[PDB]
Every structure is written in C-alpha cells, then in structure tokens.
Design a protein around this ligand. Structure first.
Ligand code: ZA2
Ligand code: ZA2
Ligand code: CL
Ligand code: CL
Ligand code: CL
Ligand code: CL
Ligand code: CL
Ligand code: CL
Ligand code: CL
Ligand code: CL
Ligand code: CL
Ligand code: CL
Ligand code: CL
Ligand code: CL
Ligand code: CL
Ligand code: CL
Ligand code: CL
Ligand code: CL
Ligand code: CL
Ligand code: CL
Ligand code: NA
Ligand code: NA
Lengths: 467, 472
C-alpha cells in the first residue's frame, strides 16, 4: 500500500504528513468497511464495534495493495514545512514555546494543498492543524452573526449597531479588552475593531427572528452542541480544528459556496476499483450577494490594520504579493490563550492558529503582531514554491447585490422620524449600503440600529439632532 | 586638496572647474568652514561681513584656497554606511512611487552624541535629478514639529506631564474656520499619549497657546537647536504652519530629544588641515542643554509609543518583518503630514542614532493618502536594515530610560491631576476613579485636579466633560 501526492509521487508505503494522510486514509477505509458490512449507525454508535472497525481499517491498509491519492502539493507542503522551521521562532514571545497550526485550502474544491501541524513533529507530536480544537473567538463573527444577518436581509454593509455598554443576563458587563463599550457604529467599524457587543446584539436578533443558525453552521460541517449561549457569536461554546475552520472561510471566499474539506482524493484496490473517491457536493450556504458583501468587509479588516499587522508585514516581504486581493479576520480568546488569523484570496484560504498545548496565556500582541508576521512569511514561502497559486484575481460584488443610499448616521434611508413626539426630518451625509435582500435598506426609524436600550437611543438621537 | 571619509579614505580630489551628492555637500561645507577661517585670519568684523560684495570676495577666496591649496578635508561620512544608504535608495526607492509621479526623498543619519552626519540620501538618483533633498530642500515639518515646539516645551516649563489631558473638542482659528485634522472637526478630552499617537491638531494649538499666554521663550528653545522661524505669532505654528526646514536641520532637533535633551550641532566636516600642518578648522564640541534630562526622557517614552501604537506609521511592523531583532532595538519617532499630503516626514531614533526622512515632489503636488503611513515607513525600514547590515552594532542595544530627576505623580486617568474634591459649580464633588502614574519635569509634580483640568477647552466643553466624568 502506497500514499501519494496530488501528482502521483509517493509519499510513503504502509513527519506529520505521513500520520495525517494515513489517519484520514484510515477513516475513509473505516466508512467504506462499515458500509461494506451494512453496520447501522446504532451499532456504529457502539464503542467495541468502533475499536474493531478502526483496527480492521488499519490492517486493510497495511495488508491491502491500496493506492491512496492525497490532495497534498509536494512543493507547497514542503515549502510550508521549511517556512515553519525557518520562521516558527517568530511566534515565541516569552510565554514558553508557542505551537502553531495552518491549513492551505483550494477555495473552489475544498482540497487541502498543504498544512503545518506544529513547530516540530520530533519535539511534540500533537497535530494542531487537524486534531487540536480551540475556540475560534472573533473569527466566529463573520460566519455566525454578521454573514447570517445579511443573508436574512436584517442587515446591510453600512448598517448601524450598538456598542453601548450592556450586560449579559447574569448582569456582568459584556467586555472587549478593557472596554465596557462606546456607542453606535457601522458594521465595518464593528468588524475592523472586533467589538463584542455588536455581535451579541446581532445573534440576539437572529434568535428573535427565529433564524435557523444551526442550518447555516451545519452545512459547513460545524458541530456546536449548544446554540443557546449569549457569547456564541464571540466564539464562546465553540471549539474547532484549524482544518474545519478553514472550511468556513473557504465558504465565504468561494462566493458563498461550500466544498467539503478533504486530504484524500482516491483509494484504489490492487485490481484498481475505487474503494473511495472524493465526491463534490457544492452547497450554497450564503447567497452570492451575502458572501461578496462579506468579502468587501473582510478586505478592510485587513486593510485597516486595527487587529493585525499582516498587510504591513507582507508589503515589506513581497510588495507584489501584498497586492493580491487579501481578505481576512482575526480572533483572540479572552485571556489571550488562542490567536487566529484567517486569510483568503479568490483562489485559496489559509487558516492559522497559535497557542499553548496546555491552554495558558500568550503575550498581549501574539496575535496582532507575531502570528501576523509569521503568516506573512508563510504566505511568501507558498508563493516562492508555486508562484501563481494565490492568483491576482479580485473579489467583487455579485450583480444581485442591492445598493441603497442611506444616511451615514443611521445606516437607513433618509426621511421623517418621530423623536419624542417632535417628528423630525432626518437629513445629512449619505453612503452606499450594500444589501442581500430585494428592497435594499428601510427608511430610517427611531430604532435604527442593531441593539440599544432606550437610554442609548435617547443619547444617540441627541447627537444626530445636532443636525 | 582631498576630501576623505571619517577613516581617511579619499572620496575625491578637488580640482578647478573647466569653464555625487557626496562630493558637492562635503565640498560646499568645507568651503563654508574655509570662508569662516579666512574672514577670521583677516579680522573682518561680522558687521563688515554683512557687506554683500564682501560675502562674494570671501566666498570666492574660500573656493580658490581649496582648489589651489594642499588641504586635507576630513568628513564625518562613514563609507560603508553611506554606501549602504545609496544602495538602499537605488534598490528600494521604487517603494515610494505611489502613482503620483517620481517621489523624491531625503534622509540624514546622525550620531546622537556628537551631531556628526554618518550618511545621507540626497534623492532618488543624482544623474536624473541633482536637487539635494537632504541638505537644500526646505518643506514644512508638519506634525513632527509638535514634540519640539509644543509638548516638549510645555513639559520642560512644568506646564504639563506625561498623562496630562488636553482638549480635542472642535475649535476655530481666530478667523472662524474650524481647526481640522484629516476630516475631523475634533473629539473630546484625551491624554498626551493619545494626542501624540494619532497626531491630532487641536491639542497642539492649545499647547502653543498656553505657552504664549505664559510668556515662554519658545524662540529661545528653537534657536538653540539652529531653527530659523521668521514669525512665531502664528496659530498653526505647532502643526508646522510657517516653518520650513531641511532634513539635516530637522534631524538635529530630534537628535536633541534623543540625546537626553543635549544638542550637538550637525556637521559633515570634522577637520581641515594644510600640507604644512596648519589646522584651519576643527569641529569644536559645544553641547547645549536645550530641554532638561527629565523632559527629554519623558518625551522619549511618549515617542516610543507613537511608533509601537502604529497609528500613523506601519514602520515597526515593516521592520519586524525585515529584521525582527533590529525591530527590538529601542525605537522612538514621530510622523508628519502636510495638509494636502504634499510632504511626509518620518523621524526615528535609537539612543545612539537619529534618522530623519522626508518624501514629496519637487513641484509640491500631492502624494497619495498613505504615502507616509505606509510607503515611507516601509522604505525607511528597508533603509534602517541596510544601515544595520553594513554596520551591525551601529544602532546600538541601549534603551531609553527615565532620568532619576523625573518626578512621578499618581493621577486620575480622567483628569490628569491628583484625585480630590472640585468646585463643580455649586455641589462640591469628590473626584475618585481609575489611577495612573504621570511623569513631570518640575519640582512638585502634577496639581490637585482643578475645574479646568486640561490644556484648552471651552466652557461648554468642560460642562460636557465634567458631566460625563461625574457619571460614576
Ligand atoms: B474577538 O476574538 O476579537 C473577541 N472575542 C472574545 O471576547 C471571545 C472569545 C472566545 C470566547 C468568548 C469571547 Cl466573548
Ligand atoms: B500632522 O502632520 O499629523 C498634522 N499637521 C497639519 O495639519 C499641518 C501641517 C503643515 C502646516 C499646517 C498644518 Cl495644520
Ligand atoms: Cl509534515
Ligand atoms: Cl504534487
Ligand atoms: Cl459573565
Ligand atoms: Cl439555531
Ligand atoms: Cl466543528
Ligand atoms: Cl437553541
Ligand atoms: Cl479526507
Ligand atoms: Cl492595503
Ligand atoms: Cl426584501
Ligand atoms: Cl552620494
Ligand atoms: Cl517666542
Ligand atoms: Cl531652520
Ligand atoms: Cl512673537
Ligand atoms: Cl560641516
Ligand atoms: Cl601648506
Ligand atoms: Cl513594538
Ligand atoms: Cl501595521
Ligand atoms: Cl503622587
Ligand atoms: Na481579534
Ligand atoms: Na502624521
């Protein structure tokens, strides 16, 4: 039995590359054998059956004469190994040795071209790309809060949300770093800064409208045991591998269309019948309008440089590659335990995590600076190895996107609002807001933003009233 | 006659003209030193020397003396470094072109302890454009003025400390126009750290306004650093309004802050000696304490955060990517941007060196929006690295640190002054809250909180501020 690269080159006969691809090879054989023997999912639920079928899948691979075709690009995977050997030291920050996981994924197929499993398989065998699960934190926000709210037509690109101080149900303040919050802001600013309260209100709105949020997340392969959590949009109650989470940003980057992640393409018996072949099941999870609007937002998350120095780092390493159409989002857990940076061009998504195996804190700036700088170095290694793999294509608004002229101040169409009895003529600076519904944005009404108390609205309307 | 590098290697021999940047700059300055020495030797008075045909005669005589004579001219120019600077601009200059044309450039590397100029960049390519953008060009230093003319003086005079609050509330010039910053009429109260990081304008306006109300001799300070500003009675002076400088002079103001407040006059010539042994000129060390050590070291701490905040420069990010270990040196700096983005400045120091940097167009037209935020910052990280590669210890590993004379005060985040009770317009109030350490350069430290706790701000501003404070 043999395991090969995408081109056919032998990886090995039956150091992360071996164990990862063999393991997935095995899971594939497992499904196949259980299918071959008509084991129902009840018996499959059973633990000693599980052990038996696992063992049988493994021997079937050793004893069989199987050709196992992987999706791994040798040059690219190899360059990624070198990148982490050469530049992994950039992660270490005086909190101990910082572990890393990266998965490089073709956005149009979901194939995985290469990955980084950890700083050094010899030193530490944990596989941080495929096995370790950590809260994805704020990188949850585009997928589960904002993207869904837009796809449902509850929100456009320049909609306003409350970042006024507010409490969880226990009465503790919702915090972001040191801040209890500020006031109204646009989706764009909420996203660039990664504020927490606007995300809380958004998911709260989705529950109020009874939106099938599980539907969305499950179509991307996400398994979240409990959706009834106030901090869910922030990453609370969620734990994901780098591979699975990469698959989510693949969905946004591929114009809303999911392709299931995979590292095994084909398994052929000695006589050459396919025991397993990868079967494309493209799923439209977000509308093309919603995914393309989200792309324009996530472009500016990087551009703005508020929570990541990535675009600066990359410019200094390779100004040409800095000009590809990068979009992305960062994540940071509450005690700086885990940092994420997810990056896409139209062709590829590169998911990246860092943290400690025992879950203890990183440095304040581990995500903003170190992982950003390490990931720029990695992206540049992938380029050198395979020089047009990223592409210079641009993300663009889908024709079905609807434009609205809204007031900058309310994110809604200008007109008459009643403000404590005195009805007023809301006028002023306007912007183009992008929506994914039919009618675009509504007329401005008193409760114009996502979230906010009465005290907040009093206060906010006061400022707008300074006409 | 020969001009050499600091180590004695010959840059060039000087011959009469028939009828790069490095040659003409050093020659032009050698000539200025010979001018001084000839007027001297002939006892011409500096009033006699205001006679204009007399400038001409003594300038021509100084040119001739060098041409004819057998003079050894020792410059301060470090050959490997200067050479690395010329390669860096040739290799990375293109990073400055942003779509508005051929972006010109001036850089001056200075030793903070002596004022010696180790190297410079005169421009993009002497053979295409001979204008010397390091020594000749004068442009507004824009916001890079603020630490020198506004905040550093106010701290020095005891009128403000590291965590003093200043107004950024909307305010007008005397002519009724709003003071603008980018596109913003302003915000509210903010710390000195925030005013400096974002480079707001209203806090500098109020700072200079204070200095003027106090009768502070701002001119005294600036002139001790060699700055020539014809009119100090300008509202926007602390933003760079009514100031034009060369990169060499302006690098010298930053050298003064970096050197714990002690100015050394910039120079490119260290010695002229004749074949017979006469030393016709030798650089005389003349250190001047322009700001106190407490002020300069306080200012150093704030300028460290200007760069690390990355608000108006990507520099520390660019440099981290090029050379992480070099990025860990103790960098401090300030950016400048003129109103229409005509001119971008970035000034950088470690304890050992100051590197000034300007970009812009010879004809003064606009650069792109991010020319200084990103392009200059990235080109200068490349320059700082090339200097490093040429001379790996030259930037040094020393840290900037508070002088012992600095006075520390425990102060309210919200007011910048000691906690206590305040006349909040009938209803005496007890001000409590978040505490921070504030550094002062005086004897006594910060005040107890007064009603008017900030630099600047109207009656209505203070109603607004105090209302929001009290809400605890
Ligand atoms: B975001 O990563 O910028 C901020 N996220 C959080 O604060 C978050 C992360 C994990 C669990 C819960 C929360 Cl609120
Ligand atoms: B600073 O460069 O960030 C802001 N400075 C200016 O706005 C300025 C520049 C030159 C002349 C006058 C002004 Cl206000
Ligand atoms: Cl590997
Ligand atoms: Cl391959
Ligand atoms: Cl809580
Ligand atoms: Cl749900
Ligand atoms: Cl999952
Ligand atoms: Cl639920
Ligand atoms: Cl697979
Ligand atoms: Cl950018
Ligand atoms: Cl609709
Ligand atoms: Cl030169
Ligand atoms: Cl004066
Ligand atoms: Cl001057
Ligand atoms: Cl005056
Ligand atoms: Cl000189
Ligand atoms: Cl002689
Ligand atoms: Cl830093
Ligand atoms: Cl940056
Ligand atoms: Cl005190
Ligand atoms: Na984040
Ligand atoms: Na500036």
């Amino acid at each position: 039995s043999e395991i090969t690269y995408s081109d056919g080159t032998v990886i090995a006969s039956i150091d992360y590359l071996y164990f990862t691809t063999l393991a997935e090879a095995q899971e594939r054989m497992y499904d196949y054998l259980a299918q071959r023997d008509n084991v129902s999912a009840k018996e499959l639920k059973n633990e000693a059956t599980q052990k038996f079928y696992r063992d049988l899948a493994a021997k079937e691979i050793e004893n069989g004469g199987y050709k196992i075709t992987t999706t791994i690009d040798q040059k690219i995977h190899s360059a990624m190994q070198s990148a982490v050997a050469d530049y992994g030291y950039l992660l270490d920050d005086g909190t101990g040795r910082v572990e890393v996981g990266n998965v490089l994924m073709d956005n149009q197929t979901g194939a995985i071209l290469g990955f980084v499993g950890g700083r050094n398989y010899q030193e530490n065998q944990n596989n941080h790309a495929f096995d370790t699960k950590r809260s994805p934190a704020s990188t949850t926000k585009p997928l589960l809060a904002y993207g869904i709210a837009i796809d449902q037509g509850l929100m456009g690109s320049e909609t306003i949300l409350s970042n006024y101080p507010t409490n969880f149900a226990n009465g503790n303040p919702i915090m972001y770093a040191n801040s209890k919050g500020t006031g109204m802001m646009t989706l764009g600013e909420a996203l660039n800064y990664s504020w927490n309260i606007p995300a809380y209100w958004t998911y709260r709105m989705l529950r109020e409208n009874g939106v099938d949020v599980k539907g969305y997340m499950e179509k991307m392969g996400y398994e979240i045991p409990e959706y009834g959590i106030e901090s869910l949009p922030m990453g609370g109650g969620i734990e994901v591998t780098v591979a699975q989470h990469t698959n989510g940003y693949q969905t946004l980057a591929n114009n809303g269309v999911y392709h299931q992640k995979h590292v095994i393409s084909k398994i052929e018996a000695a006589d050459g019948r396919v025991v397993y072949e990868y079967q494309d099941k493209p799923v439209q999870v977000y509308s093309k309008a919603t995914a393309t609007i989200m792309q324009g937002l996530l472009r500016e998350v990087l551009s703005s440089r508020v929570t990541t120095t990535f675009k600066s780092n990359l410019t200094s390493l390779n100004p040409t590659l800095a000009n590809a159409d990068w979009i992305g989002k960062t994540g940071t857990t509450g005690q700086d335990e885990n940092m994420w940076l997810m990056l896409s061009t139209p062709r590829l998504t590169l998911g990246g995590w860092i943290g400690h195996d025992d879950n203890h804190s990183l440095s304040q700036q581990a995500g903003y600076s170190n992982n950003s700088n390490y990931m720029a170095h990695l992206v540049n290694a992938i380029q050198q190895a395979s020089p047009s793999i990223w592409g210079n294509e641009r993300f663009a608004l889908d024709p079905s996107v609807v434009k609205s002229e809204v007031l900058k101040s309310t994110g809604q169409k200008p007109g008459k609002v009643s403000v404590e009895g005195k009805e007023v003529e809301v006028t002023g600076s306007t912007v183009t807001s992008y929506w994914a519904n039919k009618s675009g944005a509504p007329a401005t009404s008193y409760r114009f933003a996502i979230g906010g108390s009465d005290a907040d609205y009093q206060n906010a309307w006061s400022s707008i009233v300074g006409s």
